[PDB]
Every structure is written in C-alpha cells, then in structure tokens.
Amino acid sequence: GLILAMAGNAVGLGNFLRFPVQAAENGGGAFMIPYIIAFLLVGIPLMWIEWAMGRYGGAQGHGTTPAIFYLLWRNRFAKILGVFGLWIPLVVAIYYVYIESWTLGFAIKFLVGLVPEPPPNATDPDSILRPFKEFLYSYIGVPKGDEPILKPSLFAYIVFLITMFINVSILIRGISKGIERFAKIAMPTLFILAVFLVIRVFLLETPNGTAADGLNFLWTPDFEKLKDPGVWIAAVGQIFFTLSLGFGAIITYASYVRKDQDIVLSGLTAATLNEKAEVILGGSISIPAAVAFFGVANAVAIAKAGAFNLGFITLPAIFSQTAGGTFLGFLWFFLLFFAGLTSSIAIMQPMIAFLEDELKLSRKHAVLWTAAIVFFSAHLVMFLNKSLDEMDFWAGTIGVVFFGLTELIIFFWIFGADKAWEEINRGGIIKVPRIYYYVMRYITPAFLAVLLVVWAREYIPKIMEETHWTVWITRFYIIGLFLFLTFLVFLAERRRNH
Amino acid sequence: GLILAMAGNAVGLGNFLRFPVQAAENGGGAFMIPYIIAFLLVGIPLMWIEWAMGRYGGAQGHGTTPAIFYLLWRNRFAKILGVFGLWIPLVVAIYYVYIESWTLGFAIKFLVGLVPEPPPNATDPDSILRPFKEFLYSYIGVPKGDEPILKPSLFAYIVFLITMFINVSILIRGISKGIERFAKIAMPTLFILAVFLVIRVFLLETPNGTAADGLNFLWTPDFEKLKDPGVWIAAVGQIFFTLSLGFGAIITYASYVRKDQDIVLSGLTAATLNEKAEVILGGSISIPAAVAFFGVANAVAIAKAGAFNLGFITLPAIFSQTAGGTFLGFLWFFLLFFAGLTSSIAIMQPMIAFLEDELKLSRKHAVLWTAAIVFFSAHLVMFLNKSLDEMDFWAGTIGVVFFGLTELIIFFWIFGADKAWEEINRGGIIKVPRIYYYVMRYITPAFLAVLLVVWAREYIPKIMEETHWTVWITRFYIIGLFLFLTFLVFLAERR
Ligand SMILES: N[C@@H](Cc1ccccc1)C(=O)O
Ligand SMILES: N[C@@H](Cc1ccccc1)C(=O)O
Ligand code: NA
Ligand code: NA
Ligand code: NA
Ligand code: NA
C-alpha cells in the first residue's frame, strides 16, 4: 500500500505526545472545535496543495523549496521565502530526534524493569504524581525553582547518541529489508496495543477522577476561549505538525513521485488514518488517564510545563495499574520510538536533499553534515530550560502556519488559481469537490492571514517582554540558523548560473 | 616601499588599547621580561615565515591558509588546521570593530564637548575615578554588580552601525586616493601627538601618585611571577596580536607579493616600527597616567575588569588636566579610530579572500556576507557581559600562539627547514643571520609547544569551572563558528 508510506512519516511523535499536550494546555473542547475546522478548511486542502506543488516542480528536476517557489514565481523574494522549507524541518529535527530518544530510553528502562510505581499510601493527586513526574524529570534533568540549566542523566545523553547513530545509518544505507519486515509487524502491533489501551483506560476508576471525566474535559467546548487566537493558532499548527504539512517535507517527496497519478484519494486517506491515530488513540488514551490519575488541574499543569512531557508521565501510570503493563510499556515506547524514527528520517530529508541537488554533496557527506548541525544545536535543547518549547513554538506552531499560507499564495494566487486546480485533480481516482476551490482561493488563505494578524497584535507585546535569557538565546540561535541557510541558498544560486 | 603598508597593518588598537591592558593585568616588568623575549624568539622569526609562506602559496593562486597548508602538506588534517587562519580573524573582528566604534564614539563626544570631568573639592582616588569610569560604562552599558546583560546606549549602537558602514565601503570600493591622501597626514600627526602626550604624562603629579611611579610599575621586573605560564602566554599572545601574526592575515597580504622581493629588511623594519609605537608611545602614556591619577590598585583592577577599557578611562583623565585637552582628545580618539580602520579592513581580508578564491563569490558579495557574520556575532559582545573578553582570550591570546606554532611546524618540519630558509632569504636585500635558522627550526617550536602544555595543566581546570553562563555561550558560539568554517572549506573541495 502506497498510503502506508504516506502515513509512515505522518504517524509519529505528534500523534501520541504532542497532541495530548496541545489539547490539555489550551483547554480541551475549546481546543477541539478549531482543531476540527482546521482539519477540514485548512489541513485537508493544503495536503492536496503540497503534493501538487511537489510533483509539478519535481517534473523539472526540483526537489527543494526555493527552487520550486522560484519556478512558480520568478522573484528573488520567492527563494527567500523558500528557506523556511529548510529552516522549519531543521529546527524541528533539533528537538524531535531528542524527544524520539526519550522513547527509546524509556523502552530500555521498561525492558530491564526500571519502572515508576505509585506510592504505597497516597490516594491523592500530587502524591501519586510525584513518582511518575520524577521518573521523567530526573531523566531529562529538570531542576527545582525554574533554574535555567538542565542536568540530564548520562543514560539520557548516551541514548541520544545511539538514536542519532540509528537515524544516520538509515539515511545513508537506505530502507533495509529487515526494516520492511519489522514495519509490517509494528503497524498491526501498534494498532492492536492501542485497541487494548483504549479499553483499559475506559474502565479506569480512581479516587481522583474517572476516564469519563477526561472525555468530558476533552469534548465539552468553552466558547469564551474561542476569542483567544492563541488557542486557534495552536490548533491550526498542530494540524500541520501531525500531517507533516508546513514543513519542506511533502513537497520534496512529491518531487520523487510521478505526475498523472492519484494525489486526491490517497492524500485524503493518509490524512484520515493519521487523524484516526491521534484523535482516537493518541487523544483518548493519554488525556483521560491523566485526568483520572492526577485530576484536571495537575493534567493541565503538566501540559503547560512542557511540549511533550504529558504522555511520558501518564502512560507509565497506566502500565503500573495493568497486569503485564511493564511488558506492554516496553511495546508501547519501543513502537512509539519506531513511529518517531520513520518521521525523523523524513524530517531531515529536505535538508539532505538540498545538500545533494544544489551543493553537489554525496549521500554520506550530506547526511553526516546535516546530523552535525542537528547534534550540535540539540545541546541547547538538552541543557537550556524551556529552549525545547521555544523551538517547538516558532517552528512547530507559528512557522508551519506562516509557511502554509505562503504555499497557498505562491501556488494558488501567483501561479494561478484555475491553473493550480488542474494540477491537483490530474490522475485523481476521485475528484475534489467544487466547494474546496472557493475555500482554497477565498476562505482558507483569507483566514490564516487574519489569524496571524489578530494573534501577533495580542501576544507579540507579551513575547517581547520575555524575562528568561535561555529563551532569548534560543531565539537568537534560530535566527542565525535562518541566516545560515539563506547563505547556503545564495551559494546554490551563484552555482547554477556559474 | 611596502613598509608603510605593513605599518598600517600592524599599528592599531593593540598598540594603544590592548597592550596597556595586558601589561597592567599581569603586573608589568613581570610582563615585559617575557615580552622582549617573545619579540626576539617568536615575533621576528614568524614575521618572516608568514611572508615567505604567502609568496610561495600566492604564486599558485592560493591566498588562504587551508589551501596553502594543503599545498605544503597534502593531508586532510592540513585543511582543518588551516581553518584557524579563517577563524581567528573572524572571531577577532567580531569585537575589534566594536572596540573601533568606541574610539569613534568618544571622538564625537570630544568634538561636541561631552567630556568627563573630575569632581571638585575631592582628591579621593575613588571619587576622581568615578566620573571617568561612568563615562565609559554608561556608553558600553556596564551594569553595577556583575549582572550578565549589558545595556549599551543607543548612541553606542548607532556609532557601531556607522563603523560597519565605513568598513564595508572601503572594502568594496577600495582605498580611495582621498583617504590615501589622509593616511599620509594622519599617521605622522598621531606620532607627533603621542610624543607630546608622553612628555605631558611624564610631568604629571597627583595627591595619589606620580608618573615616575607608573614607569617603576611597568619596567621593574618581579621574578616571582616569572614562573606563571598565564603571564608568559599573555605576552606571547600580545606579540602575535600587535604584529598581525598568528592570523591568516599576513599570509593573505603576502599572497600578492612577487617571490623575488625583499622580506627580511622590510619585515624587520615594520616590526620594530610597530614596537616603537607600542612600548614607547602606547605603553608609556596610558599606564604611567593611570597610576598617577588613580593609583596602582585601581590601574590593575581596571585592566582586569575589561579587555580594552583602561585606555578609554585613563586618556580622558589626561585630557581633563591638559590645556586644549578636549581638542587634543578629539584628535587622539580620531587618529586612534583611523589606526583601527586600516587594521580592521586587514583583519577581515582572509575571510573575503576565502569567499572569492574558493566558493567563487564576487567582491561585493564576499564583503557583505563577511559583514553579516561579524555584525550578527557582535551582539554577543555588545549585550553579554564578559563575552568580549572571552573571544579576545581564546582567539587573540591562546589561538594565535597555537596557530603561529602550527605555521612553524608545517613550514620548517614538514615543508623542510632548508627549503624554508631558502624561501625566506630569496630576493632579500640582506640575509637572515644563521643563528635564526636554529631559532626557527629548534628553539621557537620547543618553546611554544612547552608553553602551551604547562599553561593547559595549570589553567584548564579553572577554565572548566566557569560559573558565568555568558562565557559558556560564547565558548559554544565560537565552537559553532569553527565548525561552520570547516563546513565551508569542505564545500570548497567538492565544488
Ligand atoms: N507528522 C509527523 C512529523 C513529521 C513532519 C514532517 C515530516 C515528517 C514527519 C508527526 O506528527 O510526528
Ligand atoms: N596588529 C593589529 C591588529 C591586526 C591584526 C591582524 C591584521 C590586522 C590588524 C593591532 O595591534 O591592532
Ligand atoms: Na512516523
Ligand atoms: Na502525526
Ligand atoms: Na600593533
Ligand atoms: Na592600522
């Protein structure tokens, strides 16, 4: 199935770790209403856009974003906007591989038996949260008092090295046959273990809450929080993150596929299985269990205190109250690691492809230098408090929605609305309904543009008053990354005409 | 002929700002004894070596250290060590241009009469230091109490922009005939002004000290601190800095010289001319006056609190007591600005020369991108406390004594001492005395290698115990710059 490779990179850490965080910190229910609208009016059509843009420029030997933007709009300002097609995946990879290494480190701990346990006599939210919170915080090195320096354990650093070595050895060697035999075993195993864990979580009855309260917290909307654009832009950004949109990823992969081929039905199918994997499996396992085990206030606080910490704290609590949970926990975090592994090798693909097709580097050299830029930068994420969340906000939330609007104007307003409508439907098994045409030309592009404006007039004053230097150094570091990548595209521009 | 071009290279901010700080920071006399030894055993021989390597490499179209090292020694490790010939000039330029902008800002202050004045009815050495300390600290934004974030004035930021604009213009359009007409008037005027100031300083007496006490501070040796390797490595590092050695700068300028011109006489004349402007002019004005005005305790404390601050505090105190001092303060800081301008366009030369010969960028593009890296990186030294001092130590002190040793190993142990001796003395008006053949081949490398080791086993443990996050981020940043420049050299080969 060709829809499984389109969802093998879509289903990853965003489904089981980022979604519970994004939903619980933004309210739940108040977050789900725009999250559904973003999937219909924004997420689905942009999937059709990036596959159409990619195979269009890919038919002329262009797999990189600046080369395709300039092919769709001949202007040096288009190649500058194409740098986000390299900057966003690079910044996300700086922490994504690190979060991926957390799942491998937890899998090794569960296999060997090092698991967190609830206290003997607690039966109150903060006391039973402490063993599971300290299990994660002492691994990633969270101190007390909001001190800016993290002290991760030596085991966590070594597991990060091993995770980098696994990503590099696959990007160089390629997809192996044993990996293909392991992938066809992990896809049912993940979507069978997920079935049991939805049943297990549903009958959770604790003195601190019920799973029914977690589903009540997640599916009852608060309409006064719909006036908050930070809730809206967190929802439209999570849609882009989970669908692998707003990066430079999908446009690079359609460059390697063929024209006169279906990008409509298969593009709609992988976008649905992915939402089935995180709304049902990623959303009704982690969130209701956190509300049942720790209550609402503590579940929201854990979600606000990190970008991926909720699932790492909630799932071991489930497995501590389940017969054989230590074994199932090994399966959970090892399969979650494989989900992140197939995504991280995909996130780092546009950067490696740029060093190949534009700077004429070999596979071995393009991979190893890309890994050097990720490993070196990851030390900010590993050792600076809130540095990981900052990269996740500007690349994984704000960056994807700005770069998603940019794609929707270059391809649908400058390249031609009717001209782009033909590129989407070519070879389609089914046809895109006519109502999406007016949505892609007048509704969605004139909605993301308004959201970023109504958001920036309210939160940018709060952002520029940031007091933590660990945050400003991260903002300074990622600006240097965008300038560094702009310099690389310049070296490619003075090489094509040289 | 070309001696004045080497003197516009050498004579700069290291002569009048850094040398007073480096000497007063380690004591003086205890600093000058290894300083004179470093000029004879290290500075002079490595001046001839960099000029000889540049010619031999420039004759084949190479002007940067990664390509010239690989030409003399065909190894992967040669191009990696050649990155320092790009990294040290880049790191130094990150803060050198900013220090250059200070002299321009003070020149504008003194032109319009915004001068610091000592308080009346007070001879307290802390009360008279206070307004001169505040004049600099309010400009560069030093807070009270070791806070990590600097807050320099808006005027200091705008003047930095203009200093960047002046460097970019001259680097693109070249040295105009109007400013070449200016250099022949400015550098003589600076020498005449400095000879006047040392006469003025020598006639200083205060209720807190005299200038004769200052000369006793700088020239009376202390033999207990002669066993401190940090003092030895600061004197050797200063010799490299003031003579423009230990960079890839002299090698790039030598890459345009014919292989049959004179190196020995012209290089020895420029080095000695530079030292006269440093110990006789720069060192004899700032330090004796700081001791006379503020005392020895404060002169050492100011030298340790910053990397270039002492000259900016001491000199306006001199001008506050001299008739016509505000006008003389204008000419001093303006000719000090021009002395830094001709030096900073030479510092950014290896980076520009690497973006053209390799990577095949135009002159307009190589200057603007080099100016972008420097301008971006300068915000660390502008806003993070002790970041400027950290870059100045690892590049301007430790890096130069390491890269100078590296140039010496590859040219006299790998390329061949008999071939290098033939290449230095080729076309020379006079010949190098035979005693330097054994200094270059045996004495100098055995001296620099030992000095680096004994320094590293007495100070690396204290370096790893840093308590300021602002210095670890600077160390993290400059490691990133070296990896970045190693990536560009890699892109040069596979082009
Ligand atoms: N969509 C993936 C992340 C990803 C983005 C871009 C390319 C590949 C993967 C996730 O939710 O985990
Ligand atoms: N030697 C100069 C600095 C410099 C170094 C290298 C090249 C050019 C200038 C000084 O003392 O100020
Ligand atoms: Na995946
Ligand atoms: Na996903
Ligand atoms: Na000098
Ligand atoms: Na100069």
Q: What is the set of domains in chain A, with CATH numbers?
A: 2-496 (1.20.1740.10)
Q: Is A149 helix (H, G, I), strand (E, B) or coil?
A: strand
Q: Specify whether the CB–CB gap between B247 and B9 falls below 8 A.
A: no
CB B65 within 8 Å of CB B351: no
d(CA A32, CA A23): 7
Pocket test of ligand 2: the residue of B171, B347, B400 to mutate, having most ligand atoms within 8 Å of its CB, is B347
* Sign of the dihedral through C-alpha A288, A291, A296, A302: negative
**Identity of the residue in A372, A469, A483 whose CB atom sits nearest the CB atom of B376:** A483
- Which helix (H) or strand (E) is A123 found in, with range? none
Distance CA(A132)–CA(A130), nearest Å, equals 6
Spatial separation of the C-alpha atoms in residues A359 and B244, rounded to whole Å: 35
Which amino acid is residue A418, in one-letter code? D
Query: What 3 state SS string does chain B have?
Result: CCHHHHHHHHCCHHHHHHHHHHHHHHCCCCCHHHHHHHHHHHHHHHHHHHHHHHHHHHCCCCCCHHHHHHHHCCCHHHHHHCCHHHHHHHHHHHHHHHHHHHHHHHHHHHHHCCCCCCCCCCCCHHHHHHHHHHHHHHHHCCCCCCCCECCCCHHHHHHHHHHHHHHHHHHHHCCCHHHHHHHHHHHHHHHHHHHHHHHHHHCCEECCEEHHHHHHHHHCCCCCHHHCHHHHHHHHHHHHHHCCCCCCHHHHHHCCCCCCCCCHHHHHHHHHHHHHHHHHHHHHHHHHHHHHHHCHHHHHHHHHHCCCHHHHHHHHHHHHHCCCHHHHHHHHHHHHHHHHHHHHHHHCHHHHHHHHHCCCCCHHHHHHHHHHHHHHHHHHHHHECCHHHHHHHHHHHHHHHHHHHHHHHHHHHHCCHHHHHHHHCCCCCCCCCCHHHHHHHHHHHHHHHHHHHHHHHHHHHHHHCCCCHHHHHHHHHHHHHHHHHHHHHHHHHCC
Between CA B209 and CA B485 the distance in angstroms is 50
State the method.
X-ray
Q: Is residue A369 classed as helix, strand or coil in its secondary structure? A: helix
Q: CB count, 10 Å around CB of B205?
A: 11
All residues of chain B having their beta carbon less than 8 Å from the beta carbon of residue A361 are 494
Distance B167 CA to ligand 5 centre (A): 19
Cβ–Cβ under 8 Å, residues A389 and A194:
no
Residue with tokens 């992988």: A270
- The residue of A357, A476, A478 whose CB has the most chain B CBs within 10 angstroms, and thus the best one to mutate to test that interface, is A476
**B158 to chain A, minimum CA–CA distance in Å?**
20
Phi and psi at A124, nearest 5°, equal -145, 150
Q: Retrieve residue A194's tokens.
A: 């997920």
End-to-end CA distance of chain B: 39
- CA-nearest of A286, A316, A288, A291 to A301 is A291
**In this structure, are residues A31 and A220 in contact, taking their beta carbons and an 8 Å threshold?**
no
Distance, C-alpha B438 to centroid of its chain: 28
User: Using an 8 Å Cβ cutoff, are A291 and A214 in contact?
Assistant: yes
Whole-number Cα distances in Å, A413 to A343, A409, B471: 31, 5, 49
Using the atom order of ligand 2, give the atom closest to the CA of residue B19.
11
Taking alpha carbons only, the member of B364, B355, B455 closest to residue B90 is B355
Give, as residue ranges, everything with CB less than 5 Å from ion ligand 5: B 10, 14-15, 242, 274
Decide: A12 in ligand 1 pocket, CB within 6 A: yes
Ligand 2 pocket, residues with Cβ under 6 angstroms: B 9-10, 12-15, 241-242, 244, 247, 249, 343, 346-347
Coil, strand, or helix at residue A362? coil
What's the CA gap between A369 and A346, in Å, rounded?
Answer: 16
List of residues 6+ apart from B348 with CB closer than 8 A:
B89, B93, B167, B171, B367, B370, B371, B374
Token representation of residue B339: 């002395």
How many CB atoms lie under 10 A from the CB of residue B305? 18
Instruction: Give Cα separations from A227 to A224, A238, A440, A452, A455 (angstroms).
Output: 6, 19, 24, 14, 11
Q: Which residue ranges of B make up the annotated binding site for phosphocholine?
A: 76
Interface test with B, best of A94, A381, A491, A494 (most B CBs within 10 A): A491
Looking at residue A145, the DSSP 8-state letter turns out to be S
Q: Give the other-Cβ count within 10 Å of A107's Cβ.
A: 21
Cβ(B420)–Cβ(B109) below 8 Å: no
Resolution, given in Å to one decimal, reads: 2.6
CA distance A380 to A383: 5
- Euclidean distance between CA atoms A86 and A88, whole angstroms: 6
Task: State how beta strands B205-206 and B209-210 pair.
Answer: antiparallel
| Closest residue, chain B, to A148 (C-alpha) | B469
Under a CB-based contact definition with an 8 Å cutoff, are residues A239 and A35 in contact? yes
Which secondary structure element, helix H or strand E, spans residue A307, and what is its range? none
Q: Which of A9, A94, A337, A345 to mutate for ligand 1's pocket (most ligand atoms within 8 Å of CB)?
A: A9
Residue partners of B87: CB distance under 8 A and separation at least 6: B395, B399, B478, B481, B482, B485
Do B469 and A149 make contact, defined as CB atoms within 8 angstroms? yes
Measure the CA–CA gap between A103 and A339, rounded to whole angstroms: 10
Q: What are the beta bridge partners of residue A205?
A: A210
Query: What tokens were used for B243?
Result: 């003579």
**Helix residue spans in A243-362 (DSSP H):** 249-254, 265-275, 283-304, 309-320, 325-347, 349-357
What six digits make up the tokens of B56? Answer: 């031999």
* CA B97 to chain CA mean position, Å: 11
- Report the candidate in A344, A147, A129 with the shortest Cα–Cα distance to residue A249: A344
CA-based nearest distance B170→chain A, Å: 23
Residues of B in contact with A360 (CB under 8 A): 494-495
| B435 CB-contact burial (10 Å; exposed 0-12 / middle 13-18 / buried 19+) | exposed
> Among B220, B201, B231, which residue's Cα sits nearest to residue B22?
B231
Q: Tell me the CB-side half-sphere exposure of residue B324, using CA atoms within 13 A.
A: 8
Q: From the CB of residue A368, how many other CB atoms can be counted at a distance below 10 Å? A: 15
User: CA A359 from chain center: how many Å?
Assistant: 28
Q: Which of A365, A369, A494 sits opposite B361 (nearest CB)?
A: A494
Burial of B448 (0-12, 13-18, 19+ CB in 10 A): buried
The number of beta carbons lying within 10 Å of the beta carbon of residue B299 is 29
What is the longest distance spanned by two Cα atoms in chain A? Answer: 74
**Residues 6+ positions from A236 with CB-CB distance below 8 Å:** A34, A38, A42, A43, A401, A448, A451
C-alpha B260/C-alpha A78 separation (Å) is 52
Q: Which residues pair with A206 in a beta bridge?
A: A209
| A-chain residues near B148 (CB < 8 A) | 469
Report residue A205: phi and psi, to 5°: -130, 105
The strand pairing partners of A452, in sequence order, are none
Question: Which residue of A281, A343, A349 sits with most ligand 1 atoms within 8 Å of its CB, as the best mutation to test the pocket?
Answer: A343
Cα–Cα dist B250/B269, whole Å? 15
